[PDB]
């Protein structure tokens, strides 16, 4: 139906230029211009403007008009925003969503985000930890496991417990920045008949570093 | 520029039962309000436009409404995966400027923690550095404090908080409280302790550990 998927999230040090592309879908490209939204972290909402897909002329939003640049690529009917000289505070995640009529005042259908973190930070892998307990059954007859996924930079990690099958019972606790990297972390619980009989695994992907782990979190007690 | 206003910020109401977003303008914008919900981890997604039309598909329990300068936007028979961030933007006159946001807290019945003290890993350990990693599970309501403790000495410094946001299937939270530490300050000391004060009772929980077999 319509869809838009828009680029993987980019790590850009202060200073330089991100095109970000918005590749739409499902619907005719030259008859619905585009929105570009900021979601900051802290903040909420903010319309950065809209672009004519058919004249191609852009209304910039005053907070913008200048360090941003929207185009399109209208024979791949994709939309692009890019930011030139990025200024930390442009971290983000930047949204693309269809003007429903011209000038956008309804974005219906909106697109994934694309996250911009503009950091002088050096790429880190992560160091993957398998979090066995000191025995300790947690609650009626589960246990529960963990994975410390730690030091790396920047996000994101992709932590699944046992490629994906270990659904239910998890819990993968938020990434938090100590400062320079970044540490996360998951839980998962499991009845008894489960561990350590069938093999639990954490397998952690950093494709930053282009890092792929699989840990067994095997009894250590 | 029109500025809309969302006061308040947070919102709690339990399941099936109603609640009422309020959005307001700073002059006669004339019904031209969009209510978008923003589901924790996804897009927004449109509900409703020109104060009170859905858009393909948002069921009937939401009702959009208002006029002049107030609008609301109300949800009924709330479903635990209601919970979400809650805008307006306006749809009048250019630029097209949004609320602060309201987010839809599930109230829940009590839930006590699930606390689970974990010891550094031997490869962690290898590499010098030690790290008690304690687990609150599934736990209503949100506040939950937890102290370190090594050797009865409260440790109050090198510990990282983070909290998962409320679950959309239970309507409960969860923490993972990590303590950082030396390996050689580790070995300097034996008794490790996760101990939490929630609601729940009265006599903290409180978890504690050190290697021995099972």
């Known amino acids: 139906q319509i869809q838009l998927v828009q680029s993987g999230p980019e790590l850009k040090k202060p200073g330089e230029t991100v095109k970000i592309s918005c590749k739409a879908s499902?619907?005719?490209?030259?008859?619905?211009?585009m929105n570009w939204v900021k979601q900051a972290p802290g903040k909420g909402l903010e319309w950065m403007g809209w672009?004519?897909?058919?004249?191609?002329?852009?209304t910039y939003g005053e907070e913008f008009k200048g360090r941003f640049a929207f185009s399109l690529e209208t024979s791949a009917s994709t939309a692009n925003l890019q930011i030139n000289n990025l200024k930390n505070e442009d971290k983000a995640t930047f949204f693309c969503?269809?003007?429903?009529?011209?000038?956008?005042?309804?974005?219906?259908?909106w697109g994934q985000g694309t996250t911009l973190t503009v950091s002088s930070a050096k790429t880190t892998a992560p160091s993957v930890y398998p979090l066995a307990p000191v025995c300790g059954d947690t609650t009626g007859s589960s246990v529960t496991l963990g994975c410390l996924v730690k030091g790396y930079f920047p996000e994101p990690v992709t932590l699944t417990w046992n490629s994906g099958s270990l659904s239910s019972g998890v819990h993968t606790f938020p990434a938090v920045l100590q400062s320079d990297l970044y540490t996360l972390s998951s839980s998962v619980t499991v009845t008894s008949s489960t561990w350590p009989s069938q093999s639990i695994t954490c397998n952690v992907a950093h494709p930053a570093s282009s890092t792929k782990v699989d840990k067994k979190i095997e009894p250590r007690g | 520029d029109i500025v809309m206003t969302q006061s308040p910020k947070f919102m709690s109401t339990s399941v099936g039962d109603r609640v009422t977003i309020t959005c307001k303008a700073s002059?006669?914008?004339?019904?031209?309000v969009v209510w978008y919900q923003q589901k924790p981890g996804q897009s927004p997604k449109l509900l409703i436009y020109?104060?009170?039309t859905r858009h393909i598909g948002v069921p009937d329990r939401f009702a959009g409404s208002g006029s002049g300068t107030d609008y609301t936007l109300t949800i009924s028979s709330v479903q635990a995966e209601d919970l979400a961030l809650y805008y307006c933007?306006?749809?009048?006159?250019?630029?097209?400027?949004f609320g602060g946001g309201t987010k839809l807290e599930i109230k829940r019945a009590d839930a006590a923690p699930t606390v689970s003290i974990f010891p550094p890993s031997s490869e962690q350990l290898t590499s010098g550095g030690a790290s008690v990693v304690c687990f609150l599970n599934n736990f209503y309501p949100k506040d939950i404090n937890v102290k370190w403790k090594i050797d009865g000495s409260e440790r109050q410094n090198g510990v990282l908080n983070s909290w998962t946001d409320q679950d959309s299937k239970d309507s409960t939270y969860s923490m993972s409280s990590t303590l950082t530490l030396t390996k050689d300050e580790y070995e300097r000391h034996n008794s490790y302790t996760c101990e939490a004060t929630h609601k729940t009772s009265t006599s903290p929980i409180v978890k504690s550990f050190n290697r021995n077999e099972c």
């Open positions: 933007q306006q749809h009048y006159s250019p630029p097209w400027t």
């Open positions: 672009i004519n897909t058919n004249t191609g002329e852009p």
């Open positions: 020109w104060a009170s």
């Open positions: 002059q006669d914008v004339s019904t031209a």
């Open positions: 969503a269809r003007g429903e009529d011209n000038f956008g005042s309804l974005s219906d259908y």
């Open positions: 499902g619907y005719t490209f030259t008859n619905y211009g």
